[PDB]
């Protein structure tokens, strides 16, 4: 019993969008979704943020798989990760959008680059803790491979403690699928 909201980076840098969708797919199909099971909402961000669908638009695990594979990349001349997370926190995770009172809030952030708005990331993360939201962050290192160090510390600072059981690291958009297993069986 836990409402899951995936915060997808859809900026110009993300490529190809096919592997990102293959990731959602391979992850969302292993879940039992329902009003009394586990709900999932997806938010995409770039220069701006947009709700793909709310936590309770779909009550079936299959209805979620079809809608998911229907998500289009919106692009973006910036990677406003802070804006994306903060928007999921105070907009997605709200009763109005399907958040279930009492249930555990879980946020999944996937990005491939340092955010342009990293100056409000600290504040945004702290507000996620204050609302007790478990955070799992996934960093795609493609574009950097340039040290990925500072990039890594930023994405980690997004995941909840302990970092080791919340933060993931993949070589590129293709390697995203090699996480679904560990990712899921760690959200239990």
């Amino acid at each position, epitope marked *: 019993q836990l409402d899951i909201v995936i915060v997808l980076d859809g900026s*110009n840098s993300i490529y*190809p969008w096919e592997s990102v969708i293959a990731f959602l797919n391979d992850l969302l199909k292993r879940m039992d979704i329902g009003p009394k099971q586990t709900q999932v909402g997806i938010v995409q961000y770039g*220069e701006n943020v947009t709700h793909e669908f709310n936590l309770n638009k779909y009550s079936s695990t299959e209805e979620v798989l079809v809608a998911a594979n229907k998500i289009v990349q919106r692009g973006g*001349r910036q*990677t406003m990760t802070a804006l994306g997370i903060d928007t999921a926190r105070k907009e997605a995770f709200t009763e109005a959008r399907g958040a279930r009172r009492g249930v555990k809030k879980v946020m999944v952030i996937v990005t491939d680059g340092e955010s342009h708005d990293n*100056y409000r990331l600290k504040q945004v993360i702290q507000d996620c803790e204050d609302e007790n939201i478990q955070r799992f962050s996934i960093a795609i290192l493609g574009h950097y491979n340039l040290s990925t160090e500072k990039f890594v510390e930023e994405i980690k600072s997004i995941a909840s403690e302990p970092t080791e059981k919340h933060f993931f690291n993949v070589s590129d958009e293709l390697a995203l699928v090699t996480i679904v297993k560990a990712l899921g069986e760690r959200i239990f």
Partner: T-cell receptor
Amino acid sequence: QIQLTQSPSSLSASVGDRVTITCSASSQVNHMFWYQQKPGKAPKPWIYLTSYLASGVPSRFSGSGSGTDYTLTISSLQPEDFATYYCQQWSGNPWTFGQGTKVEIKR
Amino acid sequence: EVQLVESGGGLVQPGGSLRLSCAASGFTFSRYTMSWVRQAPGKGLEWVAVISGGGHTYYLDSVEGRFTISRDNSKNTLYLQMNSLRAEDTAVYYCTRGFGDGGYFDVWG
């Protein structure tokens, strides 16, 4: 929207002099970029991610800054550094350049 | 080595149309977001349009509705279709490769 103002608009210095160009943004940005342009030629990538030198850029060049103030510094002005230097930001739309600093060499 | 080469410039009358093209080489073109930057005579640089590797396009106000940026990955070429040209559009147009979300102009022709 973010506007960049470079200062000085132009400057004159002697070889060996330590020169520092400034770029102030109308709103904070977390990175700045610079390009060098010589008369009649395409701009050249000079400094990116605030302080990384593009391949081929001699070691006397460096970049620094944060918030709304970023700089480009030449530790020992050489005669070959005369040019117009442009700062540029990718944090606000539309992406924009500073009006540039034209640097000349004394003799 | 990585390289870009602009083409299509010339004299055109006010109200006329003109199509610019840019051939890229030395890198995996389709994976990069590309842009066009212009410089009017005796003035500064001005970003004009951008297209991501995903096909998403963005524009500078003064040209949106008149210029159209496109790309053809089978030929590793970038295009800029310019309509309703005005005297203020006079300038040297540069094809340019972007880094990250495209805002850092990595390569210039």
